[PDB]
Design a protein around this ligand. Structure first.
Ligand SMILES: C[As+](C)(C)CCO[C@@H](c1ccccc1[N+](=O)O)C(F)(F)F
Ligand SMILES: C[As+](C)(C)CCO[C@@H](c1ccccc1[N+](=O)O)C(F)(F)F
Ligand SMILES: C[As+](C)(C)CCO[C@@H](c1ccccc1[N+](=O)O)C(F)(F)F
Ligand SMILES: C[As+](C)(C)CCO[C@@H](c1ccccc1[N+](=O)O)C(F)(F)F
Ligand SMILES: CC(=O)N[C@@H]1[C@@H](O)[C@H](O)[C@@H](CO)O[C@H]1O
Ligand SMILES: CC(=O)N[C@@H]1[C@@H](O)[C@H](O)[C@@H](CO)O[C@H]1O
Ligand SMILES: CC(=O)N[C@@H]1[C@@H](O)[C@H](O)[C@@H](CO)O[C@H]1O
Ligand SMILES: CC(=O)N[C@@H]1[C@@H](O)[C@H](O)[C@@H](CO)O[C@H]1O
Ligand SMILES: [Cl-]
Lengths: 528, 532
């Protein structure tokens, strides 16, 4: 049948799912690895052992162990990101959406969820790949990877918890797609990896990583990049935090093995309950366990790799959302409220910058303040808010990506940059938050197409062209089908606005502030 | 007679001069000190010793030995600032304009010319004090002081060349005014000292210095203040420079005694010719020999005196001109010319900020650049030109004045701040230069009132109200006339920080003069540079 597929490791039986008064095939919860439980906790994934019989891929798998958000219980805007399935260490599964009739060696798109490496699920309602696969006729895969300590505890030197294993999970899911997507009507030579946040960062790490380069054709990065300040740590910092987790759980710390064996004896939630205590500073947009520059997965420093062109040369399509910082200020910065205009005083502004730039010294904090403060009206609450909404957004998302984009374009084969500034009419978050980190995703996955989700007519149309650009990029390496989205070049540095209005072409995306973040501030801090 | 006066030192015979269809009394070239010549070069000024008979005070005196500007020979715009009389080390004299008939005991205004402490004359056409004295009915004094090495050679520890002697020269003219202005109809209890550029910095230095404090009542500072980066140097830097000056003239350098004796044998021009060779860096708006923070004229750092309120508390009126830097970039920065729009390329901009901020390190230069660059349009010549202009004007004049006003106001008894942004219709300099450094002076001294100098009717009006605000400030301590229908120049307070524009348009009140950039120059950069 159309739902029965013979794979390299075994047989799989999918399910027919309805989509916009039609149908397509879905293959949910296919294992690409051996459950990383028990003795296998913190270790490099192992390929899934073949199975006899038929595997039931009609329902979503379990979600990986993660810190669940409870800031706003019941509230949809936050819960839509929380796990919607039972959590388990047995969570290394992938989802495939296959149009009907099954295509022949067609375009493949792999989704990598984000959530700062500490959280994330492949089963979220907004990651439902049926609308994208059906509308664009692409085979859509959504993978999963260990997060938090479970995927990134890094004690460099030991083979028990070497680090980056969460990234290695992603890579084995990619290998699986490579060895098996052909059986589903997908061309393994035309694979596009795409994601947002830590998932967009992930994408970039695979472009950098030699061991991952050959497992995909192109890349799409959404509001994230490898060089982000929160996306990685040195081996010594990784070890520092891993030791700090042991100290927090009263573990023996004489040796790595002794410490690792102790962390394995602990129940999943026990680790999760002390996860944030290892962070060196009181901050926002900083996550405990993330990728490490170990010399293995990543040969040298991200920067030196980027300067020397030591990375996969291909076409990339990436971009940022207008208000990346607002989600992080609401959760951790004083003055910010989900139920108010969140006007910030000068005092809450000073402390807000200290929370956004944790590594900077006093001179550094003065530079940031001087850069984002209007001194003729320094007590304007809106300006202090919007101004703080830029620091976190420029520092953590926009400027890192623009540094990436400009370093990549020097050796690459084609870059396409976007700025997403449309605020969804049915948004549940307050107006001061603007176009929030992660709210382009519902447009990339075509949710505006399902009418009972109450999107405007022009939002569905905006969703349809974002999807077409995505898919058309995936298929040809150019989002344009023969108003054009122009190529980003180091001379022109062109990009487009991604909204309901007729496409407009701009230049030098936030160059003023990004010259500060990528060049001046780093130089200052190094010198001081 | 109205023109013959019995001063404390001796008799003086003035001259009757015409002014706008009327007449006034003028006493030019009156000596207030012994000529600082021979073995008296570099030494503190001594009082003029009494004379018998009448002193002919009917003609301007000699200008002090200074570097003459020969960038544009014959050009009125630059030569109007050059010496207009013979140069001589015998230059310590002062000029007085007295209304006729003589007033009883009226308001006194003393002018201290500027010119980076290296140049300047009391005799320039723009300093003709007849118009202001006749028009505002005040007694106008014009003084002189030793400039360059002559008035500021500083070998600290030595009593032959202790430094600050040019400032001391000023103070003696001031003491003279105090001991003798009453005979001319002036009130020694009501003297306002005012000056532009190094003259405004001089005024502020007398506000800070304990020995000059009681010689005046009020103060006016124009386009200059005491803490300006170019206005003073440490005793070390003063000593280094005086040694480098000896080294440039093959002098014996074993002791201050031998070094000073060597320089006293040199002809005046011999010193002037190497004067600029002693500066630390290639730069603009930096002068060689200037006031030294000696611990005598200045008890402690200007900043600590400002912080602890160790200064004369009175009323001050001060302000700045829209484009304070253009004059300096034209003379020493590549790309700038008086025969073109002076559009500056990105390269010429980078080298420009280096010449402008000579003391800053690489990181410092980068901060300055980042602060004044429009990165979306960084190849714009107009923007690079204006950008550079503002750098030089904010750094050297405006922000150090804002720092000063802001500090003084916490202790003062009245502060009135102005922003002069009127471009004179008959200006001789190019359009890009804007409202140049020194060009409000002609309005202060009422030049626009002499119809044959070709100013517009509205320019004569501006000049009248500027002179009136100045005079009324000198008389009352408030530029505004009580219960007058005219708009009002509001007080500058630390909380409100108000100031007015000074032009032909109806007055406007603004707040926090160039804060953004001044927070950078006065607060951030100094910290940045301190961290190193
Ligand atoms: C497409 As998401 C990378 C699951 C939306 C933003 O999520 C942030 C976040 C930021 C600030 C407060 C809470 C959260 N959150 O609950 O997910 C992060 F970092 F978790 F991903
Ligand atoms: C014991 As906590 C008060 C969940 C440590 C920091 O928490 C942040 C936060 C919360 C949710 C997602 C990301 C972040 N962060 O990156 O800092 C905030 F916002 F609560 F303070
Ligand atoms: C009221 As004046 C202080 C005698 C005019 C500007 O003078 C400047 C200056 C600035 C740049 C180029 C040339 C000159 N100049 O010839 O006097 C200086 F040097 F006197 F301060
Ligand atoms: C031996 As030279 C070329 C007279 C020292 C610097 O010269 C300045 C300058 C020259 C004349 C008056 C004022 C200035 N200044 O204030 O910097 C500049 F700008 F020409 F280079
Ligand atoms: C035919 C078959 O074996 N498929 C099973 C199905 O019967 C069951 O309802 C589903 C959900 O638990 O799991 C799968
Ligand atoms: C935008 C860009 O860089 N495209 C290049 C293209 O010019 C070249 O023909 C091709 C093969 O080498 O590689 C890619
Ligand atoms: C008599 C006398 O000494 N006074 C003269 C005066 O007559 C002359 O006009 C002026 C110009 O030199 O010098 C003085
Ligand atoms: C603006 C200002 O500070 N003026 C003060 C005034 O209020 C005070 O009455 C007077 C006498 O002490 O000193 C001066
Ligand atoms: Cl081990």
């Amino acid at each position: 049948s159309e739902l029965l597929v013979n794979t390299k490791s075994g047989k799989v039986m999918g399910t027919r799912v309805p989509v916009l008064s039609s149908h397509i095939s879905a293959f949910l919860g296919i294992p690409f690895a051996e459950p990383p439980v028990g003795n296998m906790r913190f270790r490099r994934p192992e390929p899934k052992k073949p199975w006899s019989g038929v595997w039931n891929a009609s329902t979503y798998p379990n979600n990986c162990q993660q810190y669940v958000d409870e800031q706003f219980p019941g509230f949809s805007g936050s819960e839509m990101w929380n796990p919607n399935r039972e959590m388990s260490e047995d969570c290394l599964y992938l989802n495939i959406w296959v149009p009907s009739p099954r295509p022949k060696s067609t375009t493949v798109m792999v989704w990598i969820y984000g959530g700062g490496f500490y959280s994330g699920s492949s089963t979220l309602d907004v990651y439902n790949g049926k609308y994208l696969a059906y509308t664009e006729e692409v085979v859509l895969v959504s993978l999963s990877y260990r997060v938090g300590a479970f995927g990134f505890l890094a004690l460099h030197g030991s083979q028990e918890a070497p680090g980056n294993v969460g990234l290695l999970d992603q890579r084995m899911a990619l290998q699986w797609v490579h060895d098996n997507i052909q059986f589903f009507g997908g061309d393994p030579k035309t694979v596009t990896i795409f994601g947002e946040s830590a998932g967009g960062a992930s994408v970039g790490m695979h472009i950098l990583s030699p061991g991952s380069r050959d497992l995909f054709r192109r890349a799409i990065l959404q509001s994230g990049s490898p060089n982000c300040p929160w996306a990685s740590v040195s081996v010594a910092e990784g070890r520092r935090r891993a030791v700090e987790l042991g100290r927090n759980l009263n573990c023996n710390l004489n040796s790595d093995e002794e410490l690792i064996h102790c962390l394995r004896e602990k129940k999943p939630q026990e680790l999760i309950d002390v996860e944030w205590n290892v962070l060196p500073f009181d901050s926002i947009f900083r996550f405990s366990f993330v990728p490490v520059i170990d010399g293995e997965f990543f040969p040298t420093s991200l920067e030196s790799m980027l300067n020397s062109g030591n990375f996969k040369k291909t076409q990339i399509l990436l971009g940022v959302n207008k208000d990346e910082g607002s989600f992080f200020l609401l959760y951790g910065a004083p003055g910010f409220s989900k139920d108010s205009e969140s006007k910030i005083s000068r005092e809450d502004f000073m402390s807000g910058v200290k929370l956004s730039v944790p590594h900077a010294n006093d001179l550094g904090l003065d530079a940031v303040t001087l850069q984002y403060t209007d001194w003729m009206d320094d007590n304007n609450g809106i300006k202090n808010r919007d101004g703080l909404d830029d620091i976190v957004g420029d520092h953590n998302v926009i400027c890192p990506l623009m540094h990436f984009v400009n370093k990549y374009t020097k050796f690459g084969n084609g870059t396409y940059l976007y700025f997403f500034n449309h605020r969804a009419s049915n948004l549940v978050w307050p107006e001061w938050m603007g176009v929030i980190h992660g709210y382009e995703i519902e447009f990339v996955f075509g949710l505006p197409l399902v009418k009972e989700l109450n999107y405007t007519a022009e939002e569905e149309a905006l969703s349809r062209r974002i999807m077409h650009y995505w898919a058309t990029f995936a298929k040809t390496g150019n989002p344009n089908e023969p108003s054009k989205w122009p190529l980003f070049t180091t001379k022109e540095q062109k990009f487009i606005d991604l909204n309901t209005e007729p496409m407009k072409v701009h230049q030098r995306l936030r160059v003023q502030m990004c010259v500060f973040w990528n060049q001046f501030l780093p130089k200052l801090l190094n010198a001081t």
